[PDB]
Amino acid sequence: QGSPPCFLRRPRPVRVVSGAEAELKCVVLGEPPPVVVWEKGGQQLAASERLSFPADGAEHGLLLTAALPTDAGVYVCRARNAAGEAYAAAAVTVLEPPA
Amino acid sequence: SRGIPPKIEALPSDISIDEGKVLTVACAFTGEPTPEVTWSCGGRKIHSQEQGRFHIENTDDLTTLIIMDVQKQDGGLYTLSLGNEFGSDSATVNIHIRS
């Protein structure tokens, strides 16, 4: 009965000011419901006080509570089940105050 | 009304899929007029077909590549290329098949 993961909604780029929240979101289908992980710089990201992964059924997000300049870059959303994998990426830009 | 050269958004640099499973990669873009999408591997255009394991779904700002029942021979460097009347862009993703 398996069917592979697919995206209904993919993560979108976001441009934020340093210190502000940054959020990426995806909505994924598949059977069984896919497991979603997020990768940056070749490495799977782990939940902490500054990085969470809110989810509500098919909706899965990534939330930086206070984005730092070192949080900028390409984030990859990887959705997986027995049938297959789906991938989609999005760039986070973080703008630092002048001078 | 301004022409906009094509611009590929974030695309994973490396992805993995187990042999026999389905792989989906989605990537957004901008461009006005809507760019023509070309996926290639080994310098050769990937042709979407109803029958067959390779499928490509293109909209005005998205391309999704699906490879069904992935085989060892499918591994390698895939290039996404966009063209319109005002420019071109390209990016690559390296697809790794696990036995």
Swiss-Prot record, chain A:
<feature type="domain" description="Ig-like 1">
    <location>
        <begin position="5"/>
        <end position="93"/>
    </location>
</feature>
<comment type="function">
    <text>Core component of the 3M complex, a complex required to regulate microtubule dynamics and genome integrity. It is unclear how the 3M complex regulates microtubules, it could act by controlling the level of a microtubule stabilizer. Acts as a regulator of the Cul7-RING(FBXW8) ubiquitin-protein ligase, playing a critical role in the ubiquitin ligase pathway that regulates Golgi morphogenesis and dendrite patterning in brain. Required to localize CUL7 to the Golgi apparatus in neurons.</text>
</comment>
<feature type="region of interest" description="Interaction with TTN">
    <location>
        <begin position="10"/>
        <end position="12"/>
    </location>
</feature>
<feature type="region of interest" description="Interaction with TTN">
    <location>
        <begin position="78"/>
        <end position="87"/>
    </location>
</feature>
<comment type="subunit">
    <text>Component of the 3M complex, composed of core components CUL7, CCDC8 and OBSL1. Interacts with CCDC8. Interacts with CUL7; the interaction is direct. Interacts with FBXW8. Interacts (via N-terminal Ig-like domain) with TTN/titin (via C-terminal Ig-like domain); the interaction is direct.</text>
</comment>
<feature type="disulfide bond">
    <location>
        <begin position="26"/>
        <end position="77"/>
    </location>
</feature>
<feature type="modified residue" description="Phosphoserine">
    <location>
        <position position="3"/>
    </location>
</feature>
<protein>
    <recommendedName>
        <fullName>Obscurin-like protein 1</fullName>
    </recommendedName>
</protein>
Swiss-Prot record, chain B:
<comment type="subunit">
    <text>Interacts with MYOM1, MYOM2, tropomyosin and myosin. Interacts with actin, primarily via the PEVK domains and with MYPN. Interacts with FHL2, NEB, CRYAB, LMNA/lamin-A and LMNB/lamin-B. Interacts with TCAP/telethonin and/or ANK1 isoform Mu17/ank1.5, via the first two N-terminal immunoglobulin domains. Interacts with TRIM63 and TRIM55, through several domains including immunoglobulin domains 141 and 142. Interacts with ANKRD1, ANKRD2 and ANKRD23, via the region between immunoglobulin domains 77 and 78 and interacts with CAPN3, via immunoglobulin domain 79.</text>
</comment>
<comment type="similarity">
    <text>Belongs to the protein kinase superfamily. CAMK Ser/Thr protein kinase family.</text>
</comment>
<feature type="domain" description="Ig-like 152">
    <location>
        <begin position="6"/>
        <end position="94"/>
    </location>
</feature>
<protein>
    <recommendedName>
        <fullName>Titin</fullName>
    </recommendedName>
</protein>
<comment type="function">
    <text>Key component in the assembly and functioning of vertebrate striated muscles. By providing connections at the level of individual microfilaments, it contributes to the fine balance of forces between the two halves of the sarcomere. The size and extensibility of the cross-links are the main determinants of sarcomere extensibility properties of muscle. In non-muscle cells, seems to play a role in chromosome condensation and chromosome segregation during mitosis. Might link the lamina network to chromatin or nuclear actin, or both during interphase.</text>
</comment>
